[PDB]
Curated annotation (Swiss-Prot), chain A:
Disulfide bonds join 159-213. The chain crosses the membrane at residues 49-68. It is found in: Cell membrane; Postsynaptic cell membrane. It comes from Rattus norvegicus. Highest expression is found in the olfactory lobe, piriform cortex, dentate gyrus, hippocampus, granular cell layer of the cerebellum, and in caudate-putamen. Keywords: Cell membrane, Disulfide bond, Glycoprotein, Ion channel, Ion transport, Isopeptide bond, Ligand-gated ion channel, Membrane, Phosphoprotein, Postsynaptic cell membrane, Receptor, Signal, Synapse, Transmembrane, Transmembrane helix, Transport, Ubl conjugation. The postsynaptic actions of Glu are mediated by a variety of receptors that are named according to their selective agonists. This receptor binds domoate > kainate > quisqualate > glutamate. It does not bind AMPA without coexpression with GRIK5. The gene is Grik2. This is Glutamate receptor ionotropic, kainate 2.
Curated annotation (Swiss-Prot), chain B:
It is found in: Cell membrane; Postsynaptic cell membrane. Ionotropic glutamate receptor that functions as a cation-permeable ligand-gated ion channel, gated by L-glutamate and the glutamatergic agonist kainic acid. L-glutamate acts as an excitatory neurotransmitter at many synapses in the central nervous system. Binding of the excitatory neurotransmitter L-glutamate induces a conformation change, leading to the opening of the cation channel, and thereby converts the chemical signal to an electrical impulse. The receptor then desensitizes rapidly and enters a transient inactive state, characterized by the presence of bound agonist. Belongs to the glutamate-gated ion channel (TC 1.A.10.1) family. GRIK2 subfamily. The postsynaptic actions of Glu are mediated by a variety of receptors that are named according to their selective agonists. This receptor binds domoate > kainate > quisqualate > glutamate. It does not bind AMPA without coexpression with GRIK5. Sumoylation mediates kainate receptor-mediated endocytosis and regulates synaptic transmission. Sumoylation is enhanced by PIAS3 and desumoylated by SENP1. Ubiquitinated. Ubiquitination regulates the GRIK2 levels at the synapse by leading kainate receptor degradation through proteasome. It comes from Rattus norvegicus. L-glutamate binds at residues 50-51, 99. This is Glutamate receptor ionotropic, kainate 2. The chain holds residues 640 to 747 of 908 of the full protein.
Curated annotation (Swiss-Prot), chain C:
It comes from Rattus norvegicus. Sumoylation mediates kainate receptor-mediated endocytosis and regulates synaptic transmission. Sumoylation is enhanced by PIAS3 and desumoylated by SENP1. Ubiquitinated. Ubiquitination regulates the GRIK2 levels at the synapse by leading kainate receptor degradation through proteasome. Homotetramer and heterotetramer with GRIK5. Tetramers may be formed by the dimerization of dimers. Assembles into a kainate-gated homomeric channel that does not bind AMPA. Can form functional heteromeric receptors with GRIK4 and GRIK5. Can form functional heteromeric receptors with GRIK3. Interacts with DLG4. Interacts with NETO2. Interacts (via C-terminus) with KLHL17 (via kelch repeats); the interaction targets GRIK2 for degradation via ubiquitin-proteasome pathway. The postsynaptic actions of Glu are mediated by a variety of receptors that are named according to their selective agonists. This receptor binds domoate > kainate > quisqualate > glutamate. It does not bind AMPA without coexpression with GRIK5. Residues 1-141 are extracellular. It is found in: Cell membrane; Postsynaptic cell membrane. Disulfide bonds join 86-140. Glycans are attached at residue 87. L-glutamate binds at residues 25-26, 74. Highest expression is found in the olfactory lobe, piriform cortex, dentate gyrus, hippocampus, granular cell layer of the cerebellum, and in caudate-putamen. This is Glutamate receptor ionotropic, kainate 2.
Length: 214, 108, 141
């Protein structure tokens, strides 16, 4: 459904788009060698009678002892680990994207624990696209699993945001060809030429360039 | 004013009881099941060895989840020696998977 | 201590036992789901088969009101019970969005005349009117 469904139906001979390397995406279309790297990570917000009074100060001590304990017991999110062990934040990803495809068909312990949280909450924590992903972070308590090049662009724009955690995985952005074309290898030699002349990383600071916040 | 000092020590005691509690729940990485859950402290074996082959061909749910972490992080966690295994533990957070005897060469 | 809020909070503990109407749409859904939270919930009800799958929604009310038991109703019949009886509450949210439907046999000729008879019935505003004639169970907060 979406890109690849049109590619195997031989509609749109080129696809050029954020199509990413996923093993299930390679089986039905041989899409081309990528032009730019990729890694999924989290986009959580950057934050913002002497005995009678003796019982009272011991009552306020233990209640302030417990309140500061559980608060300190609560971990600030700096990984996918503590993000998985905390059901207060209602994290999710793009529905029917390569992100949720990765968390579904992976068998590693912590990311399967993340998929157990999202499959119970398929109606709520899943979004339509990255714009629905950005807004649910900025308004409500949420931590969004967008891919790499959308992370640095929005953190340069919205200084309310930050990148939490390193690269969960490693991928790239490919170009969709229908089932595997001979025209695919013409593109592969072309992208090697276009990155050699530097115009790949010259259009880089042309279009991301969001000026940041130190 | 002595009652004001009586409150500021209570918040200091409550701050001290909060910090002394959370560091006494903390258990370090003792066992493999204590090591199977966390993905910060990374794993590793000798590439193409008997230990790498065992985790690939085991059906134990504790050890199969450990293989999925090393297969995903393939080019960085499977060093190729026992010597580079010593270097990567001595540097950043890394739990290398030796055989039992070559432990006692290194841990002495 | 957090009480049993969600299904994933309820999927781990084996003390507070589970249950559905035997041979219902809820029992069938947990048997034929691939979600790892819901597949582990089915293994508890399949193992405890003769004691957790009661056969009514009425015996489901009796077993929650007695010992520790979390019965798995549909979403609407919650609000009949959680307004007639203020000892019971809806913990969690919607597990899976379903829909009640008038069941006709396979390839029935009456199916296309019930569907138009329903789409007229809510535009006249009586599926909402017949709704608040039976769900007003005394309004118990
Ligand atoms: C600042 O903190 C408040 C609560 O203390 C929170 O509601 C708000 O979202 C925070 N600001 C930002 C920009 O997240
Ligand atoms: C982002 O931060 C600016 C100030 O830095 C603030 O005015 C704005 O409301 C924030 N947007 C949010 C929290 O969505
Ligand atoms: C159940 O609810 C009724 C109505 O509020 C109340 O009187 C009763 O004490 C509750 N508990 C039991 C065990 O019946
Ligand atoms: N690159 C993703 C979309 C963006 C995302 O899900 O983070 C895809 O091909 O589905
Ligand atoms: N003794 C092991 C190598 C060391 C290890 O993998 O721990 C072997 O024969 O492969
Ligand atoms: N409405 C359900 C019965 C009630 C339930 O299982 O929660 C059905 O059609 O089977």
């Amino acid at each position: 459904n979406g890109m690849v469904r049109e590619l195997i139906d031989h509609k749109a001979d080129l696809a050029v788009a954020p199509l990413a390397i996923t093993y299930v995406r390679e089986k039905v279309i041989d899409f081309s060698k990528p032009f730019m790297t990729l890694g999924i990570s989290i986009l959580y917000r950057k934050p913002n009678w002497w005995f009678f009074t003796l019982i009272i100060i011991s009552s306020y001590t233990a209640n302030l002892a417990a309140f500061l304990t559980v608060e300190r017991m609560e971990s600030p999110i700096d990984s996918a680990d503590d993000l998985a062990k905390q059901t207060k934040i209602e994290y999710g990803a793009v529905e029917d994207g390569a992100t949720m495809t990765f968390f579904k068909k992976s068998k590693i312990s912590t990311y399967d624990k993340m998929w157990a949280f999202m499959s119970s909450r398929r109606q709520s924590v899943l979004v339509k696209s990255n714009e629905e992903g950005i807004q649910r972070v900025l308004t409500s308590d949420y931590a969004f699993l967008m891919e790499s090049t959308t992370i640095e662009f929005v953190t340069q724009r919205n200084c309310n945001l930050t990148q939490i955690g390193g690269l969960i995985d490693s991928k790239g952005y490919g170009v969709g060809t229908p089932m595997g074309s001979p025209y695919r290898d013409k593109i592969t030699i072309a992208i090697l030429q276009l990155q050699e002349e530097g115009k790949l990383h010259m259009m880089k600071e042309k279009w991301w360039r969001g000026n940041g916040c130190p």
